Design a protein around this ligand. Structure first.
Ligand SMILES: [Fe+3]
Lengths: 172, 172, 172, 172
């Protein structure tokens, strides 16, 4: 195969391609969320900024996996990026809950990739995932859980001032 | 006894050892509180920061008493640091009320130590307690009482925005 | 369980709580050592400074494990912090030997925690331990072994100038 | 009496005059020690510097008591400053032991003055002594005890390198 390839299983290559698609999908979901909060009938600018940042971060995760694939002598095969499950995200609280669910699903995929790398005795790939993916995901999940907790306590979405003040104080 | 020891009663030495343990216990209680507010289902970062600061301050108080004990030629005897009375502190308001109670109990211990030093005609120890402990405790107690008053007025813990906004404005 | 919890075994949670207690215990042992060297009949200020630094570092290790526990959605349960095995540490050499023994016991606990995380297929926890605990412990153990070697060669504790000059040159 | 005098007992005035003389005597003892270490057959420049500093500090203590006496409307009555008990201080260790004894005797005098001020219900004088005299004395006594401990451990005065190296490392 590639002149650089060493200790890199075909299964791992395939799993990395899958993960690239999942990170691109996550970026697209975040972009959809960001847009929602930019609507004139929603109008929460710091929610919009928060989710646009997350969109840009997930793209960066995807690009770093592409760099890995080429560094190890695998070949990138792209697939369609599916549209998000919804256009209307209903509320700041609902979007944060949906983001938490998404981040946990991405984490689960990364844990399955680490298990595969461990099985195939690929320590460079195991180390890569941990170093750049697993601690970031744990941090993200904890931050989103904290946001959900705060919004729920404040009375969102029925208490009208809750998302407004959360947008100002936590996300601003 | 020690070559430096002068006008330092065995009772006072024993009472200082007790006070060291109480300050270490207080530090541990504050650490427990700090952690509680860091939970994903509580998620009040400025409450967590406030109590972690208090934990570090109480350790410093303990270390300053250790320095005193050696300066006067007493001998430090450490004891177990008991675990705090609870793991779940329930709410920002409840933690502030528990902190107020703790600070008053530490103050009471310091007043008993001052009375002992006065009885044993130990002016250096009397002056030390006042200079570094008694005004700090009065300031701490007043600050915690002010926090409790504000949280109660705002409607905590039942009014969901109260602890959130107090965390932002008073503790942030 | 917690909304953030994912791939985090109850065994691992329990083992982290145990490790928190061990790091707090180590901090307390170091504090005891620090105090000893501050006595008027011992009077080795740089030994005192060295062990006080180690005390503060072990507390920081404990606080970082608390942060991990909450990040993963576990719950911190604190226990009593037992008093150190002795009040009188006898000599600079004996304290360094006792510190070496303590650091090796903490390392052994961390290796058992890593083995548990490996068994439960928890790569985030495995990576955390290594990244922040295992290399620090190896460095600490090597430094303490070097100190013990030097003090022994110099003739401590029977050669009276040995601890004095080591305090000045190595620890100063 | 003086137009400024208020709540200032004749006993206290007399005791302050005595304390002035004792601080001037202590300054003179330190000056004698300083000179000794400047002899060509002793030649320990940092011991000489240390005791000259102490001499200048004790003079400053005396001058501050003179300022107090006039601030309270007492009248300063000076007495002869007796010569020190010896001209030859024998060794660095012996001079430090003699200094420790002197500092403890000055502390004892200050504690007797505080007891008198307490008896005569003179809180300004009690506070003055503590604020500027009692903590300084405790610090001085602890420092001298530490020096004596270190010199003894190092083998002074029989181990010829002990005072030389202490002069370099501790006092330099
Ligand atoms: Fe506001």
């Amino acid at each position: 195969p590639s002149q650089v390839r060493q200790n890199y299983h075909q299964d791992a290559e395939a799993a990395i391609n899958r993960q690239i698609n999942l990170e691109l999908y996550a970026s697209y979901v975040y972009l959809s969320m960001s847009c929602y909060f930019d609507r004139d009938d929603v109008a929460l600018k710091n929610f919009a900024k928060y989710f646009l940042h997350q969109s840009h971060e997930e793209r960066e995760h995807a690009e770093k996996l592409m760099k890995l694939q080429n560094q190890r002598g695998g070949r990138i095969f792209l697939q369609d990026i599916k549209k998000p499950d919804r256009d209307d995200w209903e509320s700041g609280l609902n979007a944060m809950e949906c983001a938490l669910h998404l981040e946990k699903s991405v984490n689960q995929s990364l844990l399955e990739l680490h298990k595969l790398a461990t099985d195939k005795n690929d320590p460079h790939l195991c180390d890569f995932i941990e170093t750049y993916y697993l601690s970031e995901q744990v941090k993200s999940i904890k931050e989103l859980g904290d946001h959900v907790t705060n919004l729920r306590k404040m009375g969102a979405p029925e208490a009208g001032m809750a998302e407004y003040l959360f947008d100002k104080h936590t996300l601003g």
